[PDB]
Design a binder for this molecule. Structure first.
Ligand SMILES: CCCCCCCCCCCCCCCCCC(=O)OC[C@H](COP(=O)([O-])OCC(O)COP(=O)([O-])OC[C@@H](COC(=O)CCCCCCCCCCCCCCCCC)OC(=O)CCCCCCCCCCCCCCCCC)OC(=O)CCCCCCCCCCCCCCCCC
Ligand SMILES: CCCCCCCCCCCCCCCCCC(=O)OC[C@H](COP(=O)([O-])OCC(O)COP(=O)([O-])OC[C@@H](COC(=O)CCCCCCCCCCCCCCCCC)OC(=O)CCCCCCCCCCCCCCCCC)OC(=O)CCCCCCCCCCCCCCCCC
Ligand SMILES: CCCCCCCCCCCCCCCCCC(=O)OC[C@H](COP(=O)([O-])OCC(O)COP(=O)([O-])OC[C@@H](COC(=O)CCCCCCCCCCCCCCCCC)OC(=O)CCCCCCCCCCCCCCCCC)OC(=O)CCCCCCCCCCCCCCCCC
Ligand SMILES: CCCCCCCCCCCCCCCCC[C@@H](O)O[C@H](CO[C@H](O)CCCCCCCCCCCCCCC)COP(=O)(O)OCC[N+](C)(C)C
Ligand SMILES: CCCCCCCCCCCCCCCCC[C@@H](O)O[C@H](CO[C@H](O)CCCCCCCCCCCCCCC)COP(=O)(O)OCC[N+](C)(C)C
Ligand SMILES: CCCCCCCC/C=C\CCCCCCCC(=O)O[C@H](COC(=O)CCCCCCC/C=C/CCCCCCCC)COP(=O)(O)OCCN
Ligand SMILES: Nc1ncnc2c1ncn2[C@@H]1O[C@H](COP(=O)(O)OP(=O)(O)O)[C@@H](O)[C@H]1O
Lengths: 347, 104, 98, 459, 320, 49, 121, 44
């Protein structure tokens, strides 16, 4: 793919999500979603192979169905009130349809099935865009209509997402599927606090985006897509392995690492209004995410797996293309807990 | 190759007394080992231990136990001289306590 | 609501179910998507005409435009799938698992 | 009290900026100096605690623990510089960094005046210990041990956080002084019962309780020497300190709610004392002895009387010192023989007389010989339990006998008898090991000279 | 400006530097032939850059200084031990084969990068497309097992598919008895142990697999021992060829851009050589790996980046 | 020495070094001036001095 | 969200003029020091990743890191302080405006408050 | 004498497509090293 075509497709994706996030008209939001999907489909197929083709096909089918139900919800809401503005959306049926459509766009359970497969099919660079950037628009639309969200449906889907991500991540050896299941669990975590306070949703989104970015750029630095391939980089770049272990610890939610800040905050926000059982369930379930992060860390840096002979040649060559924002992402992903109160600047 | 790894043979134990009859068991280099032993003994037994113990033994009576004893002597003397009971059952004045009016 | 609105909504629901069933082929699901879009167009234009929303009359046309894009997109992917397998069957899209 | 916190954060870069062959000397010297400085917190008012600032305060219960940690770090550094001789400079510096970070987190844990900050640091202590155990262990089981040592903690402590924030939403504050002054009784309801369980279970599993002790033998066996020292000497006392700080609000629900935990603690103390007898390993025996002593401390905290609190503090300090010394003594033999079996190396008194003397003193202090502070704490707890109920003495008495038995059993198995006839690589004891033993044992006697420093705030 | 997507966006293209004289030339021959001198003469006459055959320490001459490193740090294999004891139980044969294939892959990447960046052609002495003849010779003689050749096939399949075959392949055909006579007359004490069956298997694999496969994508110019000395004749045959059958005329600017981005950044070139396949011949334990890596790091100019080593006399470090 | 061109040369890229140093200095003086203006504005608004 | 919709709120200001009446954070604020420390850590990690002498590879790069982190942290702290001050102001105004919902209850002394006693035995 | 480190037998547990292999997933193959499946011999 030509670099000009690639950069204009990326700009079109960003323009679509900007149009979603700056529009007060429902039709313009739908147009932004359509533009985002249309310009995102070829990005997944930048490296051509049958797996990439089928991942793009599944992603397109899921997004098209979600857009269809989103437009039906918009039309019903217009039918019961001649209003186009993105607002309360009083109608329960239209609100349920919009909630389901945005859940499928986000990947929340039980609409999660497409997330692990597509991430597996696409390249790491493509995957990073899918897991990080493709969550802003549905979350923004959800935040704008959060006051009308039925708590039962949203909380049930969030809890299902957390449970399913924790259980699915326990079995995968491929790194991309592990990242996808972790993304599902994190989406559940942020979605849970949405009906109560959207500021915590935004904070969790920012921290998850930073952590996922650092994870993916570290994975790109040591070009490994499997556990065994990642077990070799201790013999080439030990510093990458150590940073990767620290980032995995942060993603697990352990204090004093930055990853503890959202969960804690979310729990606090859910305790202010008599919700006790649900945060406890979320913590005990995120223990599973911590477990499989710990297994990855054990395989990666805390032990030394056997290496190969040809690795000696790799000792003589340096990494040419260097990512500029990796150290900043790592630092913001780990050592940013003491600046917790700054979240007040998010409202 | 009837094996699985190109592994190094397991090294045998290294004895610090072989190349250094007076080793002290701190390091292979005799000079740094001797100085490590000296600083450990000086800052563990000489500075921290004895000086810390003699500093703890002479801490000022901030726990107020000699003061409590003197106060007790004065109060006992006064109360016994005036014939008052040595100790009063009520810790606070009943006049400042307002019980509920009735229990029916 | 009159019977026309409910008939259009039932048509949309039928098209959605047909898309979600996925019998054997891929062109059938694209046809189901196009049918869902047609039902949405009809519902939107009926609602717009009934309430005399003058400015909203161009809303359906824009709808149709993006419909074409979706169709084109799907067709493109279908072609690639065929060129990989010689058949547009959905059974062949199983290289990636959960 | 930043005059103690800052020197640790300066120990970090100077360790990272030292020469390749001078890291141990600098670390040991400056850790000893920091311990000497921290020895100044023992001057405690009898009225209230020392409140340095809005975040850090020191009580009569916090000061002995702080002194113990600051004294512990040099001993761990001395014990760690034997099996790390073949390591590279960067990994040695990383090991020292883990030790320094653990000490810093413990120091900031023992003096945090707010419960959420205390929880944050009490959980931040998990990362360095886990890294040490799973990176610098020796056997293949260490990974499994680490997993246990993590989850057995977290599953018990994640609910506590919720309870904590819930309290902050009800009372309005989590500061310890405000919590103590504005404390109100808890009514008998299922909600309050589960609040009690959430507040208690984390510190119960950190002791650990008899039913939740399965992680302790694994963690203490597969860890390196310094990890075992820090786990058995200070990291166990976190649960006791947390319970002693948190039981203020739990009244009066504690009197009803303490029966299952008291029963478990007593019967598990008996069971672990009995288990110590039929042990083929050497470190597992010390681990189970630690479990028994911590069960006694749990009983003391649960009955909630001033004599019980004094005995609990004394027993905590004494057990920390004694278990550290025992682990070091076992590690010396392990380095000699490269095996953990107890009956492998026998009759070591005829080959290592001074080490035999150290073994005898450690075993004597382990079985609560008078007038050592071990017996002081044990006897105070026993008297408090007897006041609680006259039958408890039976169980306590039983434990005492069993304790002595297994202690002497170990002292007889490894030191007395005849040598194994085929271990010819038992070199004479180095000066470092003897110095470590002396620095472990002398503070115990110096403290039994002046016990009021380690009797806690109820004195 | 280092080549990249931006440099491709404005200005620099690849097809505008090819002057019809790129002609990636690969010279092939059996053991102890005149292929080396023929390659040098062809490079001199045609004005192309000569690439000597990739040895065990080829990668050492591209990084740091050209001085080769110790055999423990680079290679971990020797040709003399393979000749003396081909059936050794330490897995030296396949370790040497895999290391040589990786070195040839690196050399091919270097040659392609030079041709794409400059436009001047290259003349190689043996390519990755003809490295399998030695593998088949070892396998048929029982020197290596079948799992070794399976691992080699997997690595070749995942690596060699990203590059373009040479424009023209030149083969020097020499009979086995003449090869044996030249080996005996050479004088190296180790090469006298090469059995006749090994050379026969090499030439059989060549003539049966390499040339028929290359004839479908390139132009093959077979020669003999007698006609391999007059390099002017072979140069005339090379310059009077018809290059219209290979994929080279079917390359667009985007394909050349992708290939140029791939040939540089040698880490991506060597990525798939160290696949996590655990063969006893090539797998190395954790302890030995750690020891050898620590030994390699302590080299005078290998601790830091090639510009941040004060040991080798680099200055102004604190401002770079 | 190095047989390769060593893109990081024996002397630093003085253009980038100058740009970075100038950016740091400009940011520092901008922060100083902004803080001075902010404290003056706060004092004027609150009428302290 | 509670403060997203507020009367007289310019959408993308990030620092309303009304915020200029609050005292600016001192340049030696501990949070600014922590931001500078974060910048230094990021610079050290950058040096480590590129395989350079970690402590003293590039002084200008580390200086730029620290300066950028401090520069962003100053305005972040200003906005955070403004937001907290606005929250406090709104809470006090609403409490004053609705006296019936926040009444002044009686002030009883412990001499007349009857608290049931729980013996420990 | 030395700290235990993983060997080939310990490493091969993380080589399959998924962990915890059941009978149904025992025939699942790991993906190719490069994410390119071999072309199928589709007779058209
Ligand atoms: C009451 C006695 C009064 C004595 C006055 C002087 C006291 C000096 C105390 C010094 C501090 C203790 C040092 C312990 C480490 C050992 C050092 C060492 O290696 O020496 C080698 C040195 C050279 O020998 P070597 O030839 O190299 O040895 C080769 C082999 O190792 C072979 O070596 P070994 O076979 O000689 O083994 C060493 C030897 C001795 O080594 C030890 O066992 C040391 C440990 C002692 C017991 C520890 C467990 C009990 C803890 C009690 C804590 C009390 C604290 C008091 C203050 C302590 C201040 C430090 O073994 C024993 O004697 C048997 C030990 C069991 C003793 C049982 C005592 C029961 C309690 C007694 C009452 C205590 C309170 C009295 C007042 C009560 C109120 C009226 O020999 C000695 O120095 C022996 C020391 C003398 C024995 C002291 C025994 C009693 C100590 C009680 C504490 C001090 C009391 C002071 C107040 C006045 C009373
Ligand atoms: C708060 C929320 C924060 C945002 C959430 C996270 C955002 C994530 C963005 C995903 C972007 C994916 C990506 O670029 O790869 C990640 C990339 C690693 O990927 P890689 O393997 O180095 O990429 C290989 C190239 O994409 C290989 O591609 P190529 O060689 O075919 O492309 C040529 C190259 C060179 O581009 C050109 O030649 C420019 C030509 C100008 C033509 C103008 C045409 C205009 C229309 C006519 O263009 C690019 O590399 C990508 C340009 C993207 C432009 C975006 C404009 C907006 O690292 C990052 O982008 C940084 C990640 C964090 C970004 C900052 C996040 C906080 C702000
Ligand atoms: C609360 C208080 C503060 C605490 C906050 C946390 C600590 C501080 C912040 C952390 C970030 C800053 C530094 C991190 C980046 C450094 C990268 C690095 O690798 O360092 C190597 C580097 C040595 O490399 P070299 O000298 O270039 O030559 C040797 C080669 O590099 C040869 O290198 P190599 O690659 O061949 O060595 C192999 C090694 C290479 O791998 C590594 O070295 C590991 C790198 C560390 C991981 C980075 C994590 C990112 C930050 C997150 C921290 C989490 C904190 C929460 C607590 C949980 C801890 C996990 O890999 C292994 O050995 C694998 C073993 C597996 C161990 C698993 C543990 C890994 C995680 C440990 C993290 C601990 C926290 C960081 C402590 C500082 C570490 C430098 O260390 C240094 O020399 C710099 C260290 C810092 C310098 C401080 C000096 C300050 C200014 C001096 C004067 C002081 C004031 C004067 C004024 C006085 C008034 C007059
Ligand atoms: C090898 C050879 C052995 C045999 C040879 C021995 C030679 C003779 C030595 C034996 C001496 C006999 C002992 C007789 C007792 C004399 C000393 C005693 O009387 O002093 C005590 C003093 O004891 C000290 O208080 C001990 C303090 C404990 C020191 C702490 C350890 C140092 C810190 C190191 C780290 C340890 C961490 C522990 C965590 C808490 C009494 O204290 P107290 O009567 O009331 O106060 C007196 C001063 N006043 C009245 C002005 C107030
Ligand atoms: C976890 C680390 C995250 C770091 C994020 C990246 C940091 C560097 C990026 C540079 C920051 C500049 C971005 C914005 C500056 C100018 C734009 C400004 O106008 O935005 C306004 C205000 O700016 C943003 O709102 C806040 C930006 C502040 C980001 C910091 C929050 C980080 C979380 C706290 C953890 C501590 C992190 C420390 C970082 C070093 C928007 O106001 P408004 O139109 O009304 O919002 C509508 C949407 N709402 C109400 C629902 C929110
Ligand atoms: C090593 C493993 C150890 C595991 C220990 C885990 C068990 C910890 C004990 C339970 C923890 C959860 C309790 C909740 C936290 C306290 C919060 C609270 O007190 O709020 C209660 C709410 O209490 C609850 O909802 C608790 C529900 C419990 C759900 C999760 C059950 C977990 C397992 C139950 C048994 C565990 C106890 C024994 C375990 C022993 C160890 C094996 C009051 O509700 P309000 O909203 O204020 O309304 C009251 C006025 N109308
Ligand atoms: N893949 C390989 N396996 C084993 N040996 C190889 C391989 N590739 C090259 N060699 C060795 O390289 C040596 C030199 O190559 P050759 O062309 O025969 O000699 P010369 O350089 O004099 O022309 C040969 O002895 C050959 O065995």
């Amino acid at each position: 793919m030509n670099p000009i075509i690639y950069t204009t497709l990326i700009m079109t994706v960003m323009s679509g999500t900007m149009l979603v996030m700056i529009s007060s008209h429902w039709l313009l939001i739908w147009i932004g979603f359509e533009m985002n999907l249309l310009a995102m489909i070829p990005v997944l197929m930048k490296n051509f192979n049958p797996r990439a083709t089928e991942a793009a096909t599944k992603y397109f089918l899921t997004q098209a169905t979600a857009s269809m139900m989103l437009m039906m919800a918009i039309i019903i809401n217009l039918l019961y009130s001649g209003q186009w503005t993105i607002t309360k959306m009083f109608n329960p049926v239209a609100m349920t349809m919009m909630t389901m459509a945005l859940a499928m766009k986000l990947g929340l359970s039980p609409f999660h099935f497409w997330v692990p497969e597509v991430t597996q099919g696409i390249s790491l660079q493509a995957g990073l865009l899918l897991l990080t950037w493709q969550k802003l628009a549905p979350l923004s639309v959800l935040c704008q209509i959060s006051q009308s969200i039925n708590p039962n449906l949203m909380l049930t889907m969030a809890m299902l997402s957390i449970l399913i991500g924790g259980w699915g991540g326990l079995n995968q050896t491929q790194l991309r599927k592990i990242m996808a299941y972790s993304s599902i669990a994190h989406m559940g975590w942020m979605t849970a606090v949405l009906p109560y306070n959207t500021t915590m949703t935004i904070l969790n989104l920012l921290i998850y985006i930073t952590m996922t970015l650092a994870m993916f750029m570290l994975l790109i630095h040591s070009s490994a897509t499997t556990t065994l391939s990642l077990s070799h980089t201790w013999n080439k770049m030990p510093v990458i392995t150590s940073l990767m272990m620290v980032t995995l610890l942060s993603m697990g939610g352990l204090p004093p690492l930055s990853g503890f800040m959202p969960k804690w905050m979310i729990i606090q926000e859910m305790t202010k209004n008599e919700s006790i059982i649900m945060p406890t369930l979320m913590a005990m379930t995120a223990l599973l995410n911590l477990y499989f992060y710990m297994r990855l860390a054990y395989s990666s840096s805390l032990t030394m797996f056997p290496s190969t002979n040809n690795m000696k040649m790799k000792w003589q060559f340096e990494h040419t293309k260097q990512m500029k924002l990796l150290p900043t992402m790592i630092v913001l992903s780990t050592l940013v807990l003491p600046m917790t109160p700054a979240l007040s600047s998010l409202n | 190759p009837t094996i699985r790894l190109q592994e190094d043979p397991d090294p045998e134990d290294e004895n610090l007394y072989e190349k250094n009859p007076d080793s002290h068991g701190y390091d292979k280099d005799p000079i740094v080992d001797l100085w490590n032993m000296r600083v450990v003994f000086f800052f563990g037994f000489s500075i921290v231990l004895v000086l810390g113990s003699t500093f703890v033994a002479y801490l000022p009576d901030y726990r107020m136990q000699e003061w409590a004893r003197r106060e007790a002597e004065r109060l006992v003397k006064y109360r016994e001289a005036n014939g008052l009971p040595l100790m009063e059952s009520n810790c606070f004045d009943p006049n400042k306590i307002q019980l509920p009016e009735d229990e029916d | 609501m009159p019977l026309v609105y409910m008939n259009i909504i039932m048509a949309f629901a039928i098209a959605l179910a047909g898309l979600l069933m996925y019998r054997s082929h891929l062109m059938s699901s694209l046809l189901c998507l196009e049918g869902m879009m047609l039902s949405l167009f009809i519902m939107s234009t009926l609602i717009i005409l009934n309430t005399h929303f003058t400015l909203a009359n161009m809303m359906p046309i824009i709808l149709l435009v993006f419909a074409a894009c979706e169709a084109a997109l799907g067709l493109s992917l279908l072609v690639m799938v065929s060129n990989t397998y010689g058949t547009d069957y959905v059974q062949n899209l199983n290289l990636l698992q959960c | 009290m930043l005059k103690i916190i800052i020197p640790t954060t300066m120990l970090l870069p100077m360790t990272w900026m030292s020469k390749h062959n001078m890291i141990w000397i600098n670390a040991t010297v400056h850790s000893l100096l920091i311990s000497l400085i921290s020895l100044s917190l023992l001057n405690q008012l009898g009225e209230n605690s020392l409140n340095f600032s809005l975040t850090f305060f020191s009580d009569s219960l916090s000061a002995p623990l702080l002194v113990l940690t600051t004294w512990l770090l040099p001993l761990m550094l001395m014990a760690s510089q034997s099996h790390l001789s073949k390591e590279t400079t960067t990994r040695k510096k990383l090991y020292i960094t883990m030790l320094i970070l653990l000490q810093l987190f413990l120091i900031m844990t023992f003096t945090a005046t707010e419960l959420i900050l205390f929880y944050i640091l009490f959980e931040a202590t998990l990362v360095p210990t886990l890294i040490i155990i799973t990176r610098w262990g020796n056997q293949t089981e260490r990974l499994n041990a680490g997993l246990y040592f993590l989850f057995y903690t977290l599953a018990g402590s994640l609910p506590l956080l919720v309870a904590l924030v819930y309290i902050q939403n009800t009372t309005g504050s989590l500061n310890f002084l405000i919590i103590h002054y504005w404390s109100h009784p808890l009514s008998n309801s299922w909600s309050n019962i589960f609040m009690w369980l959430a507040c208690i279970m984390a510190f119960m599993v950190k002791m650990p309780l008899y039913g939740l002790h399965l992680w302790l033998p694994k963690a203490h066996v597969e860890a390196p020497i310094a990890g075992s020292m820090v786990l058995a000497a200070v990291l166990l006392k976190l649960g006791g300190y947390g319970m002693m700080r948190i039981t203020t609000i739990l009244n009066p629900l504690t009197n009803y709610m303490a029966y299952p935990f008291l029963m478990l603690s007593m019967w598990g103390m008996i069971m672990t004392s009995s288990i110590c007898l039929r042990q083929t390993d050497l470190k597992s025996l010390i681990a189970y002895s630690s479990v028994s002593h911590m069960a006694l401390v749990i009983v003391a905290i649960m009955i909630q009387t001033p004599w019980s609190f004094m005995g609990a503090t004394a027993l905590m300090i004494a057990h920390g010192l004694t278990s550290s010394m025992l682990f070091c003594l076992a590690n010396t033999n392990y380095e000699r023989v490269h095996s953990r079996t107890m009956i492998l190396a026998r009759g070591l008194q005829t080959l290592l007389p001074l080490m035999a003397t150290w073994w005898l003193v450690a075993s004597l202090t382990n079985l609560a010989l008078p007038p050592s502070i071990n017996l002081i704490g044990e006897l105070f707890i026993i008297t408090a339990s007897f006041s609680w109920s006259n039958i408890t003495i039976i169980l306590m008495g039983m434990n005492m006998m069993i304790t002595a038995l297994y202690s002497l059993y170990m002292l007889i198995t490894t030191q007395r008898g005849k040598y194994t006839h085929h271990i010819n690589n038992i070199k004479p004891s180095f000066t470092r090991e003897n110095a470590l033993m002396a620095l472990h044992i002398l503070p115990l006697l110096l403290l039994t000279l002046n016990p009021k420093m380690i009797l806690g705030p109820l004195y | 400006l280092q080549y990249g997507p931006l440099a491709f966006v404005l200005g620099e293209r690849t097809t505008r530097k090819l002057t019809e004289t790129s002609k990636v030339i690969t010279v092939d021959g059996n053991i102890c032939s005149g292929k080396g001198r023929l390659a040098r003469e062809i490079a001199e006459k045609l004005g192309l850059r000569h690439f000597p055959e990739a040895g065990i320490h080829y990668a050492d001459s591209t990084t740091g200084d050209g001085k080769p490193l110790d055999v423990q740090l680079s290679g971990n294999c020797s040709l003399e031990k393979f000749y003396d004891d081909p059936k050794s139980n330490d897995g030296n044969s396949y370790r040497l084969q895999s290391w040589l294939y990786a070195s040839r892959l690196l050399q091919y990447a270097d040659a392609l990068e030079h041709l794409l960046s400059t436009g001047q052609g290259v003349v190689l002495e043996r390519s990755i497309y003809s490295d399998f003849v030695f593998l088949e010779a070892m396998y048929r003689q029982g020197f290596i097992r079948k799992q070794c050749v399976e691992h080699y096939n997997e690595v070749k399949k995942v690596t060699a598919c990203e590059y373009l075959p040479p424009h023209v392949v030149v083969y020097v055909d020499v009979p086995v008895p003449e090869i044996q006579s030249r080996i005996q007359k050479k004088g190296n004490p180790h090469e006298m142990k090469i059995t006749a069956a090994y050379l026969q298997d090499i030439e059989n694999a060549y003539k049966k697999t390499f040339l028929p496969e290359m004839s479908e994508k390139c132009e093959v110019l077979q020669y003999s021992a007698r006609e391999a000395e007059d390099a002017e004749k072979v140069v005339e045959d090379i310059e009077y060829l018809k290059c219209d059958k290979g994929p080279w005329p079917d390359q667009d600017d985007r394909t050349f851009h992708r290939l140029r981005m791939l040939v540089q950044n040698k880490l991506e070139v060597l990525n798939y050589t160290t696949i996590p396949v655990y063969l006893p011949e090539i797998t190395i334990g954790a302890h030995q790996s750690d020891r050898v890596f620590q030994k390699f790091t302590e080299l005078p100019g290998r601790k830091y980046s090639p510009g941040y080593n004060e040991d080798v006399g680099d200055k102004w470090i604190w401002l770079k | 020495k190095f047989y390769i061109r060593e893109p990081p040369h024996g002397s630093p890229d003085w253009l980038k070094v100058g740009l970075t140093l100038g950016t740091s200095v400009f940011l520092w003086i901008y922060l100083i001036k902004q803080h001075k203006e902010d404290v003056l504005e706060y004092k004027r608004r609150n009428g302290l001095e | 969200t509670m403060m997203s919709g507020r009367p007289g709120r310019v959408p993308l200001q990030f620092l309303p003029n009304e915020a200029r009446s609050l005292p600016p954070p001192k340049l030696t604020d501990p949070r600014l020091v922590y931001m500078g420390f974060l910048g230094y850590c990021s610079g050290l990690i950058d040096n480590a990743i590129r395989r350079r002498p970690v402590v003293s590879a590039g002084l200008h790069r580390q200086l730029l890191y620290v300066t950028s982190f401090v520069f962003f942290g100053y305005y972040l702290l200003k906005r955070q302080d403004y937001m907290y001050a606005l929250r406090d102001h709104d809470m006090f105004a609403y409490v004053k405006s609705h006296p019936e919902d926040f009444p002044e209850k009686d002030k009883k002394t412990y001499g007349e408050i009857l608290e049931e006693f729980h013996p420990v035995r | 004498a030395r700290q235990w480190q993983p060997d080939v037998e310990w490493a091969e547990q993380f080589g399959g497509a998924v962990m915890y292999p059941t009978k149904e997933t025992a025939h699942w193959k790991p993906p190719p090293w490069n994410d390119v499946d071999p072309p199928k011999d589709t007779l058209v």
